[PDB]
Design brief:
The structure is cut from a larger assembly and holds 9 protein chains of 8 kinds.
Chain C lengths: L9 E4 L6 E4 L4 E5 L12 E4 L2 E5 L6 H7 L12 E5 L5 H10 L4 E5 L3 H13 L3 E4 L16 E6 L6 H12 E12 H4 L5 H14 L2 E8 L7 E8 L5
Parallel strand pairs in C: 6-7, 6-9, 7-8, 9-10
Antiparallel strand pairs in C: 1-2, 2-3, 3-5, 4-5, 10-12, 11-12
Chain E lengths: L5 H19 L25 E2 L2
Chain F lengths: L11 H14 L4 H22 L6 H17 L9 H5 L3 H5 L3 H7 L6 H9 L3 E3 L2 E2 L15 E3 L12 H9 L1
Antiparallel strand pairs in F: 1-2, 1-3
Helix pairs in contact in F: 6-7
The chains are: A mainly beta (389), B alpha+beta (49), C alpha/beta (237), E mainly alpha (53), F mainly alpha (171), G alpha+beta (104), H mainly alpha (94), I alpha+beta (123).
The structure holds magnesium ion.
The structure holds one RNA strand of 76 nucleotides.
Family (chain I): Belongs to the eukaryotic ribosomal protein eL8 family.
InterPro entries (chain I): eL8/uL1-like, H/ACA_rnp_Nhp2-like, Ribosomal_eL30-like_sf, Ribosomal_eL8-like_CS, Ribosomal_eL8/eL30/eS12/Gad45, Ribosomal_eL8/Nhp2
GO biological process, one term (chain I): maturation of SSU-rRNA
Amino acid sequence: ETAQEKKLRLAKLYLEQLRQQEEEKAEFEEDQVAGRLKEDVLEQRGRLQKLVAKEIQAPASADIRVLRGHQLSITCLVVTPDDSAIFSAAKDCSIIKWSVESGRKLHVIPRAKKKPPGHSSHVLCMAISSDGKYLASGDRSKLILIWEAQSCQHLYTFTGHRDAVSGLAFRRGTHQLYSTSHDRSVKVWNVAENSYVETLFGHQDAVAALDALSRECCVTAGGRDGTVRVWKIPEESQLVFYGHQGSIDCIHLINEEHMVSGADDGSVALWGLSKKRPLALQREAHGLRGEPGLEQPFWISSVAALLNTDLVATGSHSSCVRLWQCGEGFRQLDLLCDIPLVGFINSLKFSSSGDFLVAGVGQEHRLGRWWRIKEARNSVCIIPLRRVP
Amino acid sequence: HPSCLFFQYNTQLGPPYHILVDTNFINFSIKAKLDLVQSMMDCLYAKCI
Amino acid sequence: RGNQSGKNVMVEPHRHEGVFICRGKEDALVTKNLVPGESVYGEKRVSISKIEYRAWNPFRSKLAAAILGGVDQIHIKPGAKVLYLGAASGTTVSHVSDIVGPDGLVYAVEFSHRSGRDLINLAKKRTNIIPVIEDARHPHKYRMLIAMVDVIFADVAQPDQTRIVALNAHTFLRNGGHFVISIKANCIDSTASAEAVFASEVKKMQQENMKPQEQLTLEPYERDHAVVVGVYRPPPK
Amino acid sequence: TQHKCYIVATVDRDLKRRIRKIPGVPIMYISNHRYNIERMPDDYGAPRF
Amino acid sequence: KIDRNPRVKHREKFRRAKIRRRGQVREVRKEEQRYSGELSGIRAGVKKSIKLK
Amino acid sequence: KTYVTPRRPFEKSRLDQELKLIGEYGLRNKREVWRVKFTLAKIRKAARELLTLDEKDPRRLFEGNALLRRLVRIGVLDEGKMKLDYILGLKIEDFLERRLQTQVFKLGLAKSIHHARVLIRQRHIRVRKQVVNIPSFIVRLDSQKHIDFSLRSPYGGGRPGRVKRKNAKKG
Amino acid sequence: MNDTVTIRTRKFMTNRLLQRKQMVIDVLHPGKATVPKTEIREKLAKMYKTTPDVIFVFGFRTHFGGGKTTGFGMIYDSLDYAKKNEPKHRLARHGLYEKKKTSR
Amino acid sequence: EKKRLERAKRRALSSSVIRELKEQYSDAPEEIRDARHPHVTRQSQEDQHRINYEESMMVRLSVSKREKGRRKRANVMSSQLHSLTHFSDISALT
Amino acid sequence: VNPKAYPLADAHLTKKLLDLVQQSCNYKQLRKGANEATKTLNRGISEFIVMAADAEPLEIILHLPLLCEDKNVPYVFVRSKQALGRACGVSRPVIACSVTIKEGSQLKQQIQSIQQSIERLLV
RNA sequence: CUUUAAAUCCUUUAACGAGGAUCCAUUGGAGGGCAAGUCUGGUGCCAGCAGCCGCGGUAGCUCCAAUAGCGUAUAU
Ligand SMILES: [Mg+2]
């Protein structure tokens, strides 16, 4: 065990250096540093990882409300922080604002003709600020457009990406925006001061998804690259995780230290910062399809997790939306129930309160026309979640 | 004219070398006490047959 | 341009027996059509005054490239029995059947069932072709269908070409017969260089009691390809 | 002459003068207490003089 | 003027070297067009194989 | 020093090999070939001297592992070829393919090798954030997917150059 | 499309022995040259709601590539404390203090 | 003689080869900090310690001309294959 | 499975095939479509042929194996035309694609390894 | 601008700056071309050496090797 002895001795030597740094950190100077540690511990206590999986019960099809106003398949959707309105976009290049309580259309942004502002190509991603003030949408025309959420008034048009924009997410509590594209670059945008900050590199293929939280940090899915990367912007560091096989299409953060991702080979994985490889791996989350001898698992199109809890929802074209439970330490994933819903689940977003789940249903996949489901309706479905102890 | 040669340069001669040994080459190698395979590898830094 | 349809042209015999030269603005290599009025793979044919010849494409056949490259002997002459290993669909086999004529016989061996159906359809029209749908690695499995032959032509493209040819040569090839083997250097050993492969293949032929006589490359039409012509069990002189 | 892939290792003077007339083939010989190569571009670790 | 820059001088030497090599050896080409002949003669008396003994 | 003059200065084979390498890779003179030959000579000598030792000798194992990792990192070897034998199999053209000039040429950014050299020398090529103007830059395995046009270059969406502005001012 | 100059503050600490606050300043200017110190002072005074006379900044180095600049800044409680606590050369940079030649 | 032996062991533990085994078996995710140099060099290490002292103490120190030239000497050296075959001794550890 | 789809790649080889196809598309070295795949075989500029076994008529791609036997070009089948579509960089399923011979290409080592693996499937 | 006690240097950056792109790379080695021209020796019309010099007139040939580097002499 020569390799083990060298690794063990090297670990002992590394601990000596950390002791010297701790003494210098111990030396409002150090009092302010200790106050920062207290807030972080209290913040950790804020994310107490509340267990609400058992109280969730499967709803009924009659309870599910179906809003139909889009011409083509819905690609993405977001929920306003106040849980009052839903913004949705589709392949018809239009954006429609829906009222959660009534289901009527509040405002409709038409497709720009080839001069009212609008999108001339398919809209792939949308993000909304934590205060509900700003709305951002990305399209295939390498453009990012900013809208005033309350009035749907166009404000800014961000240029600079060299390919289609695929991911957008606002930093929670701020107006800082992170954007990614098929040009393998990640850019930083400050919406309030309508300025460009910097560009980050490191991905080797087209980026599929992006998510962020209150920390000055974001995660991205590598697609065909097969890697998921954590971007430490102030520290100027990049973490690389190697996990499940196949293209990684969708991702969602569970808390500040965990995330869930979905792949095109049916695998769903739970990740942790401590371990490079995924902690949990659920293979064939939505079953298998195909003729005998040519069977392949259903593609995972969207994933979602309820913030600071253990509830995970995965969407595919297997005509059902599945609810999952994260195990202790996020090491096990357990299926709760199946919500019958026919079509491609292109988007899944939990409400801020957690009382309902919004699913985007389209006849086709959000990235192409490889499948077309005639029985599916291009609609935004509000799935009510009822909690009884 | 062989296609291997780019004028006077032999391109298909590769790092695995196949070499013809003469009868007097063996005897003089023993007289100088030079190991046959080992000394050839020192000259070329490659596998020699 | 090229040899457009409707152009006057002259046909003269080649140095090799059964092969002809199509002299004109361009020169093409042609063979006499055993079944007049039919094209096997869309080649251009010439009508001669009852007599018809078919052009030979050296890019789709390895025997034509060797002839155009300046080989000495092909040993395929009218009235000879030829064993062909790796017939595939039969593009080269059709030209071989033209050379041997009605008196000669061609034995076509092809393991693939997809390409095997094409040989049978070709064997419908040409009475001198005997299709054999069997693996060339086991000559004992079709020893009933084949008598003694004069020339063995191999285009099997396998790492074990010499072993396959030697097994067939011992069983079916007569004393004093000849063999023509096409070697694709990338197929036997990709790691070794092309010419170092050619020296190794020649050596293995000598260890199988076969005497190679000549070799040449097919450089204008193929890359890293060689053709070896030799004799099996030579008679005393 | 046939294959052009070998390197000739010999110490006889008349044989070496014959090989030099053949293009593209290196010659290996013994000089001092070491092996040496004559007509190789990729000589690398050869005696330096 | 070509002597002023040694890099473009070596570029010209390579271009001539490929031209001179065309006399010695034949370059490989694909069937980018349907076969229509040699564009030249077919000489049947020249024997360019290498004898093995 | 980084290069050594050839032991035999008048050799037709050596001159032909140098001509072929310079013409194919767009090099400036013989010194650029000699530097790569010298580096490969050191690497293969180290591989041989490691191959001389015992298999279970810890020095052989450790130094060979480190050398293989470095050579895989620079991209000359394959992950399936992690042995000293494949180090001995290495050639000079393998190191020649790793220069930034030929990497730019093979990636379609330039339509010629000398055009790639000119583009690099005129500060038009970037690897990640940094702008690189050294033709002999060795591209690592990870950086190979991050070669592009610089943001300030006219080809990369930047401001048009002097000639465009002067011609537009003329008309 | 407009470019902006961005200012970020790090390692902010208040030194009560000198009645001041000190911090590290990061300047984002992707396209333009190095920002002059007066512009930095007025922007920092706007950010911290003080008069520009009591900000002293120095040590500005631009990173290779021209993307970011890093410097140090200090904000005083009052002008008299700045006159009493600052080095003479930094006061002369603001014109508050003037050096005198001495005969030898 | 005890001081030389213990110091000799320390140098071997921090050799590049011993650290090379570490990232192979490190279950922790690989960290990729952006830097102009691909690998660790002695001159880059001196820059890191200087800049960490820079943020601790709010003062700018001067740099000797021989050091600044050595900085750029490493900068040109970084995009060159000169030290592939250079490895530190490991006999002290084993 | 349809027995005519004989060289069916397994799970491990499928990932290698689809990865190389996406890499070849970036280098402008890929021909997409059944008609375009046929043309490269006639011109002799093809490394290998990748076909999808899930075509509702499998019969429309069965002419490609016949052309491959004459040119000695390896070929395989994959289980999904939709998965083959993504690597080809198109928004529609693809039932046949061809990798083109390119001089000086740096994908030669990856292509050569795949060709040996395909030939191994045919015993 | 920034730098610095002050200034220089490095890093940023505004405007000018290329068709013979004359905004003109060198050193060493080996060859070709010539008149109403000069000298010498002969085998009538030749040969050697050489040739910015002629009757009158004064208003930028080729090839090879190395390349910002490249020769010579002596000793070895
Ligand atoms: Mg011009």
